[PDB]
Amino acid sequence: PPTLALRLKPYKTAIQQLRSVIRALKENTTVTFLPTPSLILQTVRSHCVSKITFNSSCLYITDKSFQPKTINNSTPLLGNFMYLTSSKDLTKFYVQDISDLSAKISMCAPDFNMEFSSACVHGQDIVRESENSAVHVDLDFGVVADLLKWIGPCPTGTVQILVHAGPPAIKFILTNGSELEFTSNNRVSFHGVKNMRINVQLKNFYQTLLNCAVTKLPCTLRIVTEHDTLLYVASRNGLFAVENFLTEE
Amino acid sequence: PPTLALRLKPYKTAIQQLRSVIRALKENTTVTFLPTPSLILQTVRSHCVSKITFNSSCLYITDKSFQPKTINNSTPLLGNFMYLTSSKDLTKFYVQDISDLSAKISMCAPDFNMEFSSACVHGQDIVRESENSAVHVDLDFGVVADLLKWIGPCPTGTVQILVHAGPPAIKFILTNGSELEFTSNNRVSFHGVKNMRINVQLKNFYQTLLNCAVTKLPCTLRIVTEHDTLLYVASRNGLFAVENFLTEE
């Protein structure tokens, strides 16, 4: 039977880094297993879609005939499935393709083993789109930390992200009139700017930053204008990538 | 294979009544499955041992060769096992005896099924002991409620239970000097009293009362003096019995 297995050392590391993100997953959150190999978490919040993709280095695949499987993370009795995989006692975690309609998940710990079969759902894949006029600014981890400390007081209202080109700058404005801005090359890196603004809910922007901050590495911000106005915020390491897509308003 | 199955209607009712108790179970809490049929939860806290026994009417047994199984409620990956059984979506729950060293638990929900095998441990059975000189007072549910409201302010210090025989009375005294007492037949029932006292931790007595109060029915208090000084507090309905054993100090 075609088996997709998690490689324990990098997976346990990754899932520990992500523990706070995984604790925050929603009722619609999906988990996708691919023969690539890949594992993808995808979550819809108001005007915000979030995707966590595990690097292939976290997985072992025995047989590429393994059919793609998407399941709900919210599991009838078990609740938050991905949270259970963050158990520090986990010794084995694999998925088997033994029926068309479902995925069979196996997990072990010292003197324990368990299996469950969850119904497959129809997933959507989300692709970061490119546009000729897009803004792209990379933020050092220290900048992300500063934004989080600033915005972290339960966050309400909106944040306006205001970008300038005259000289380059990225500016952040909150509902209460507070403003922070960055111009400085050894703190941020500008890769295409134009005079523009985007307004997003503060709660979503803060959660987005929190999720990206798990890498303790630089985060990429992009803003596009075509299908509509959208803010992309992402970070990654060699174990996983966190990507968020925030729709204006 | 010998199967012990939960009868869904009375089990789901019982487990819903007990939900708060089950949320509070400890690392040493055991779950015992018997061919009687019976299911027993047993938990050790400081000077307090608590036992929940499900009435046979909650169980169906196919084959009395089923070997007795005790397992830890704290389950490596799953965490609080009994809490998972309180899922309002549960459609099937049974235990199979297919190995000497372990119990195989199966559980279902609409489009979900799961199985796990947990290692058997060595349980102790706890028996309420009788003594010729013991105090026994039954308390109406309204009395239990009054005690809970009185003691419920996080409870610290101790409670002294002071019993009198001249005329009969049961008295409760807290560390801060507050005192409540009962003498009244249509509120409490005296079945053997003698002049005596017992002192227990307030936190344990309060938790004990909370657990018994789930029946919304009268609760039995007994106090013994032999092996040592001990307070027994219990309540039951046709679905389960809650029993607690509090050692003096």
Q: What's the total number of domains in chain B?
A: 1
Nearest-neighbour CA in chain B from A131: distance (Å): 42
How far does the CA of residue B84 sit from the closest CA of chain A (Å)? 6
Instruction: For residue B169, give every residue at least 6 positions away whose Cβ sits within 8 Å of its Cβ, in sequence order, or none.
Output: B163, B181, B182, B183
The strand pair at B158-164 and B169-174 is best described as: antiparallel
Say whether A112 and B111 touch across the interface (CB within 8 A).
no
- The burial of A55, by beta-carbon neighbours within 10 Å (0-12 exposed, 13-18 middle, 19 or more buried), is given as middle
* Paired residues of B31 in beta bridges: B41, B71
Q: Please enumerate, as own/partner, the contacts of A167-176 that have beta carbons within 8 Å and a separation of 24 or more.
A: A168/A193, A170/A137, A170/A221, A172/A147, A174/A202, A175/A202
Q: Give start and end residues of each alpha helix (H) in chain B.
A: 8-17, 19-22, 81-85, 141-151, 202-212
For position A185, which CATH number holds?
3.70.10.10
- The token duo for B71 is 């397992």
Contact B244, B233 (CB under 8 A): yes
CA distance linking residue B80 with residue B26, whole number of Å:
9
| Domain range enclosing A18 | 1-249
Q: Nearest by CB to A90, which of B77, B90, B112?
A: B77
For chain B, the distance separating the N- and C-terminal CA atoms, rounded to the nearest angstrom, is 47
Which residue in the set B76, B109, B113 is minimally distant from A89, CB to CB? B76
* Beta strand extents in B67-101 (DSSP E only): 69-72, 74-75, 79-80, 92-96
Token reading at B26: 């400890």
Is residue A221 exposed (0-12), middle (13-18) or buried (19+ Cβ within 10 Å)?
A: buried
CA distance A45 to A206: 13
| Angstrom resolution of this structure | 1.9
Tokens of A38: 């890949």
| A86 → chain B, closest CA residue | B77
What is the experimental method? X-ray
